[PDB]
Design a protein around this motif. Sequence first.
Motif, mmCIF file in Angstrom:
data_model
loop_
_atom_site.group_PDB
_atom_site.id
_atom_site.type_symbol
_atom_site.label_atom_id
_atom_site.label_comp_id
_atom_site.label_asym_id
_atom_site.label_seq_id
_atom_site.Cartn_x
_atom_site.Cartn_y
_atom_site.Cartn_z
ATOM 1 N N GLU C 43 0.786 -1.226 0.000
ATOM 2 C CA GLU C 43 0.000 0.000 0.000
ATOM 3 C C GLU C 43 0.824 1.285 0.000
ATOM 4 O OE1 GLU C 43 -0.559 -2.433 2.499
ATOM 5 O OE2 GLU C 43 1.027 -1.590 3.756
ATOM 6 N N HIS C 44 2.022 1.238 -0.569
ATOM 7 C CA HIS C 44 2.851 2.431 -0.621
ATOM 8 C C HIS C 44 2.244 3.388 -1.622
ATOM 9 C CE1 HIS C 44 4.391 0.463 -4.300
ATOM 10 N NE2 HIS C 44 4.736 1.679 -4.683
ATOM 11 N N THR C 45 1.470 2.818 -2.543
ATOM 12 C CA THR C 45 0.820 3.556 -3.618
ATOM 13 C C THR C 45 -0.148 4.661 -3.214
ATOM 14 O OG1 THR C 45 -0.992 1.985 -3.831
ATOM 15 C CG2 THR C 45 1.032 1.534 -5.061
ATOM 16 N N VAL C 46 -0.890 4.485 -2.123
ATOM 17 C CA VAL C 46 -1.803 5.560 -1.743
ATOM 18 C C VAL C 46 -1.000 6.752 -1.219
ATOM 19 C CG1 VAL C 46 -3.637 3.928 -1.181
ATOM 20 C CG2 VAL C 46 -2.258 4.837 0.664
ATOM 21 N N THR C 47 0.164 6.479 -0.627
ATOM 22 C CA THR C 47 0.988 7.556 -0.103
ATOM 23 C C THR C 47 1.584 8.302 -1.281
ATOM 24 O OG1 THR C 47 1.565 6.366 1.948
ATOM 25 C CG2 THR C 47 2.963 8.217 1.315
ATOM 26 N N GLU C 48 1.879 7.579 -2.354
ATOM 27 C CA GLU C 48 2.426 8.222 -3.539
ATOM 28 C C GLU C 48 1.381 9.174 -4.132
ATOM 29 O OE1 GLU C 48 5.836 5.116 -5.239
ATOM 30 O OE2 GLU C 48 4.008 5.427 -6.403
ATOM 31 N N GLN C 49 0.167 8.653 -4.329
ATOM 32 C CA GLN C 49 -0.940 9.416 -4.914
ATOM 33 C C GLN C 49 -1.450 10.597 -4.122
ATOM 34 O OE1 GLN C 49 -0.189 8.181 -7.833
ATOM 35 N NE2 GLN C 49 -2.337 8.251 -8.498
ATOM 36 N N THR C 50 -0.829 10.902 -2.983
ATOM 37 C CA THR C 50 -1.259 12.018 -2.135
ATOM 38 C C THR C 50 -0.117 12.981 -1.775
ATOM 39 O OG1 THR C 50 -0.978 10.706 -0.069
ATOM 40 C CG2 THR C 50 -3.141 10.661 -1.130
ATOM 41 N N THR C 51 1.115 12.547 -2.012
ATOM 42 C CA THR C 51 2.282 13.360 -1.704
ATOM 43 C C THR C 51 3.021 13.673 -2.983
ATOM 44 O OG1 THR C 51 3.610 11.391 -1.467
ATOM 45 C CG2 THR C 51 2.635 12.327 0.545
ATOM 46 N N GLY C 52 2.890 12.798 -3.969
ATOM 47 C CA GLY C 52 3.562 13.032 -5.227
ATOM 48 C C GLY C 52 4.932 12.397 -5.256
ATOM 49 N N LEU C 53 5.248 11.654 -4.205
ATOM 50 C CA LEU C 53 6.536 10.989 -4.119
ATOM 51 C C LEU C 53 6.587 9.684 -4.907
ATOM 52 C CD1 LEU C 53 7.336 11.304 -0.297
ATOM 53 C CD2 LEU C 53 8.267 12.667 -2.172
ATOM 54 N N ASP C 54 7.776 9.352 -5.399
ATOM 55 C CA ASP C 54 7.988 8.086 -6.076
ATOM 56 C C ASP C 54 8.787 7.379 -4.998
ATOM 57 O OD1 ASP C 54 9.029 5.868 -7.317
ATOM 58 O OD2 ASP C 54 9.316 6.889 -9.254
ATOM 59 N N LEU C 55 8.109 6.640 -4.129
ATOM 60 C CA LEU C 55 8.808 5.974 -3.045
ATOM 61 C C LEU C 55 9.864 4.977 -3.499
ATOM 62 C CD1 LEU C 55 6.035 5.496 -0.402
ATOM 63 C CD2 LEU C 55 7.653 7.363 -0.672
ATOM 64 N N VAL C 56 9.666 4.343 -4.649
ATOM 65 C CA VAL C 56 10.660 3.395 -5.128
ATOM 66 C C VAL C 56 11.922 4.149 -5.571
ATOM 67 C CG1 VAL C 56 11.138 1.511 -6.733
ATOM 68 C CG2 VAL C 56 8.849 1.869 -5.865
ATOM 69 N N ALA C 57 11.748 5.308 -6.198
ATOM 70 C CA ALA C 57 12.888 6.089 -6.643
ATOM 71 C C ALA C 57 13.703 6.625 -5.462
ATOM 72 C CB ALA C 57 12.423 7.224 -7.506
ATOM 73 N N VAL C 58 13.043 6.891 -4.336
ATOM 74 C CA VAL C 58 13.725 7.403 -3.145
ATOM 75 C C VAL C 58 14.514 6.278 -2.509
ATOM 76 C CG1 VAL C 58 13.449 8.445 -0.859
ATOM 77 C CG2 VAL C 58 11.932 9.095 -2.712
ATOM 78 N N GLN C 59 13.916 5.094 -2.488
ATOM 79 C CA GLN C 59 14.560 3.921 -1.928
ATOM 80 C C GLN C 59 15.924 3.778 -2.584
ATOM 81 O OE1 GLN C 59 12.001 0.421 -2.504
ATOM 82 N NE2 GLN C 59 12.865 -0.361 -0.572
ATOM 83 N N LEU C 60 15.902 3.720 -3.912
ATOM 84 C CA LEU C 60 17.095 3.573 -4.739
ATOM 85 C C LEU C 60 18.113 4.667 -4.453
ATOM 86 C CD1 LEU C 60 15.183 2.897 -8.020
ATOM 87 C CD2 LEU C 60 16.454 1.196 -6.691
ATOM 88 N N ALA C 61 17.685 5.915 -4.597
ATOM 89 C CA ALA C 61 18.551 7.057 -4.340
ATOM 90 C C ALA C 61 19.306 6.895 -3.017
ATOM 91 C CB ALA C 61 17.723 8.336 -4.313
ATOM 92 N N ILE C 62 18.574 6.530 -1.967
ATOM 93 C CA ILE C 62 19.162 6.337 -0.651
ATOM 94 C C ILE C 62 20.141 5.168 -0.650
ATOM 95 C CG2 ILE C 62 18.642 5.488 1.650
ATOM 96 C CD1 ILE C 62 16.182 7.318 1.604
ATOM 97 N N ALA C 63 19.769 4.082 -1.332
ATOM 98 C CA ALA C 63 20.598 2.880 -1.434
ATOM 99 C C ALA C 63 21.836 3.180 -2.264
ATOM 100 C CB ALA C 63 19.810 1.758 -2.076
ATOM 101 N N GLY C 64 21.706 4.154 -3.156
ATOM 102 C CA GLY C 64 22.818 4.542 -3.994
ATOM 103 C C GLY C 64 23.790 5.415 -3.230
ATOM 104 N N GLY C 65 23.409 5.831 -2.026
ATOM 105 C CA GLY C 65 24.292 6.655 -1.217
ATOM 106 C C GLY C 65 23.909 8.112 -1.026
ATOM 107 N N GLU C 66 22.734 8.500 -1.511
ATOM 108 C CA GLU C 66 22.287 9.878 -1.373
ATOM 109 C C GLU C 66 22.034 10.220 0.098
ATOM 110 O OE1 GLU C 66 19.891 11.899 -4.520
ATOM 111 O OE2 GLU C 66 21.847 12.752 -3.901
#
Lengths: 58, 428, 308, 84
Positions: C43-66
Motif C-alpha cells: 500500500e505504498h501507492t496511496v501515499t504516492e498518490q497524495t504526496t507526489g513521491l515516487d517511493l521506489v525512486a527514493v529507496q534507490l537514491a538512498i541505497a545509492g548513497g544519497e
Amino acid sequence: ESAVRLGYRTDPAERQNLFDRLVAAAYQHGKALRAATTFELDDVIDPAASRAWITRLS
Amino acid sequence: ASLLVANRGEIALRIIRTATELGMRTVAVYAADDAHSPHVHAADEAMPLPGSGPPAYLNQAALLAVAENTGATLIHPGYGFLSENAEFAKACAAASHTFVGPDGRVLELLGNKTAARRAAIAAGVPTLAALLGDARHIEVQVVAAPAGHQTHALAVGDRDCSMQRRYQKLIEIAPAQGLSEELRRALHQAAVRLCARVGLRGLATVEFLVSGERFVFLEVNPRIQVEHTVTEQTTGLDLVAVQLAIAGGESYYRLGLPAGIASDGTEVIGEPAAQRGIAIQLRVNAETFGADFSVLPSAGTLTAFCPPSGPGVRVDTYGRPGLVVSPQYDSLLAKVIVAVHGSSWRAAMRKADTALSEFGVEGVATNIGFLRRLLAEQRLETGWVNTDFVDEKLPELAAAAPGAVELYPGEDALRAQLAGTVVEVAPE
Amino acid sequence: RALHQAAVRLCARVGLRGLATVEFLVSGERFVFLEVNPRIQVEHTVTEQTTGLDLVAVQLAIAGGESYYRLGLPAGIASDGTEVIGEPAAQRGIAIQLRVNAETFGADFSVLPSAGTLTAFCPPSGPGVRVDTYGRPGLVVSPQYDSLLAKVIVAVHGSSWRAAMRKADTALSEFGVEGVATNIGFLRRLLAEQRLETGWVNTDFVDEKLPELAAAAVELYPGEDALRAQLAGTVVEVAPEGADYPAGAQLVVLEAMKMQHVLAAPDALRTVRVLVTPGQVVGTGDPLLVFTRTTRADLDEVIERHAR
Amino acid sequence: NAALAGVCDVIIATPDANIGMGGPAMIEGGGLGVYPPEAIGPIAVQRRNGVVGLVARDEAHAVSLAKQYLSYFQGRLDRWQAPD
C-alpha cells in the motif's frame, strides 16, 4: 471497390470523392446484366419471380 | 447544480467524471448513432438526441430542449461542436442556463480569425503577415476569472504541439522543451495580457509560432482542449473543475490556483509557473496507412482492449471491450498520457514507447505502430521537432510498418536473455 | 502528530536507512506500537498518490548513497536522531487502494484461490485512477503464487470521502476481468456498507460482515432503433412485442426512486423485440426494446432487355 | 492457393510459412490498408489455431513428413521394432 482501390493509386484531403467516381463507373461493367450476357449467371430475374424458380427445386 | 454535457466521446466522459467528483447531477446526450459511447452509461441521466452522427450534436434546439426537461443549471460544450459557437452561448444565457465558457461576444471576437489577430496586435503581440519558416507550435494554458471588478488572467503552463500530420496533432508535450526562460516568460506574459484584454472568463489556450527567439501569435481557443491533460499531469490541476468553478461564479482569488505569470487587469506580475516533471500525450487513433502512405480511418469491434496502466501513466479513453468503432466520428481511440519526474526527456520518451507497447488493441487498426516509430526518430532526441518534421518523415516511417508456451514434463525452454533480432537457430 | 512523532523517533534510533512503515493500533486517542516494516509495502501507492513521491525512486537514491538533505523530500515531521521538528506532512486529496485478488468463495464463506487464463482484462482508467497490476490478456494466473491480481488506486482532490468511495466503486465496476474469478464483487459490496460512510471502520468490521456480504454475491438490423432508459430505475410496465404505437403513446414505465418516469414512443412505431421484463432493474442507457419508425429503374432495364 | 491448402486433411508447413485466406493485395483492396506478407499467417498463429497440422524444420523434412503421413493410409509395415 476492391478492384478500384487496386487498379488506381494522390488525394490530400478527400479521396472519398474520386473513389466513388471510379466505383459508380466500374459498376456499369460488372453488374448482373453484363454477367448474364456471358452466361456466368443463369438469369437476372424480376424479384417477383423468386418463388417460380425456387419452386422447381423440390 | 445540474450539468448537461453537450458533447460525446472521451471529452464528454471526462467532464462527466469531474462533475461526479464535485457532486453535480449530470445529464448526457447521444445521437441515435452514438448509443453505446461510454459517456451515456456514466451520466446520471441520458436523453437521446434527434439527429444522427456528428451534426446531431449541433442541434441547438435539441440540446436546449434536453436542458429544459432535465432542469440543467450549467451547459458544458466540451470542445469542437458548439464549444466555440457564440449563438449557442447566447441562446443558453437567454434560456437562463450557464454556458460553461466565455461570454457570447468573446466567442465572436475570438471566433473571428481576422478580428482576433487585430485584438492581438492591439495588445502588443507580433503576428503573421502568412507563412513562417522553421517553427514550433507553443501553446500557453490560461485561466481567467474576475477579481474585484476586473479580469485576472493566469498562465498555468505551456505545451509543445509541433508533432502533427497534415495539421492533426499526434503528440503534445509539457512543458515545451528547450525555451529560454526569456522566451518562455515572453510567451506567458503575452498570453495573459491578450486574455485579460478581451475580457475572458474561464479556460483559454493562446497559440504561438516559435522560431528561435522570435515568436508570433497564432490563435486563441476559449474552450477546454484535447491536450489539457499534459497540463494536468505537470500542474496538479483538474482544469475541468476550474472551468466549472469559474462558471458557477467563483473568483480568481478563491480558485486557489498555483503561482505564475498573471495579468491583474492592469500590469503583468509573477514568475513563470511551476511545471513538475515532463508529460507526453499520444493520440492513439483508429486509423491505418493506405497505398500512398495515405491515411484511412479504421473501423471494427474492439475484441480486445487493454490500455497501459502504471504509475505516471494515465489514459483518458473512450473505448472499451466490445465497443464497435465507427468511422462516422473522430478517429481518436484513447489518449495515452505518460509523465515522469525530473527533466530527463529521454526517460520521458522511453516511457511513452513502453506505454504504447503495453497497449493492447484488437479488431481495429491503430496508429500505435506509427507513433511508436515516430518516437524512435533521432532528431526528436533533442527534446523537440518542428512543424514539418512529421509530414516530411511520413513516407520513411510509413514504410516502417510474449505468448504462453506449455512445457511437457522433462522439458525446459531456452529463453531470450535480452531483446533483439534472431540471426541463427538450431535444428528441431 | 503523536503517531508521526513516534515513527520518526523510533526509526532514527534503530539507525534505519530507506523506507519503513511503523504500524500502530489506534483506539480513540489511545494508541500502541504494533510493528515496523523495513521494506516497501503493497500500500505504498496511496501515499504516492497524495504526496507526489515516487517511493521506489527514493529507496534507490538512498541505497545509492544519497543523503537525507539531497533527496529533497517535502516537509513533514522528522526526527534529527535526537529531537523532533516540523509540522505534519501535507497529504493532498484522498486516495483509496483496493486489492483485486484472483480468488473465489467456497463452502461456508471460505476463501479459495482462483486460477485460469485472463481472456478479457481491462483495468479501470481515466484521471485520478491508477492501476499497478501484472495482469494482461493472455496471462495465466497460477494458484501457486499470491492471489493479488491488481491494485486499483483512486484519488480525489480536496476531501469529500463521499466522492472517494463513489470514485472507487465506479473504478471497480469499469474493471473488466474474464477467465479468472475475482473479489471485485466482494469489494464492491463492501464499499456500499454504511458504517463505512463515516470515514472508517475498525479491524473487526469486515469479519463480522463477511457472511452478510458473501451471500450478496444487442445488435439492430437496418431500420431498427432501440428505446433506452433515461435514467436508472426498476421496470414496472413494458409494451408487448409486435404492437403499433402512435407518436407519444406510453411504452415503458420505470420506477426510479419513489416516482414513475414514462418513456414514450419517439413517434409512430411498431415494437419488435423487447429486452426488458417488468420488475427488472435497469440503468441509464440500458436498451429497453427495439422498434421501427413508420420506382425501380434497374428492374425496367431487366424487363426491357428480356423483351428484346 | 490457401483455400485449397485449408480444405485438406493436413498442412505441413515450414517456419518461413505464411498462410492466409487474403493476400496483402486483398487486405488492401478491402481498405484495411497495407501489410507485409510476413504478417498474415505466421507459422506461430497457424501453429495454434489448428491450421497447420505439422511443422517441418525445412523443405526436405516437410516432404519427409508428407511421405510418412501417407504411409498410414497406404498399408502395413513389415519391419517393426517394439519398445522395451
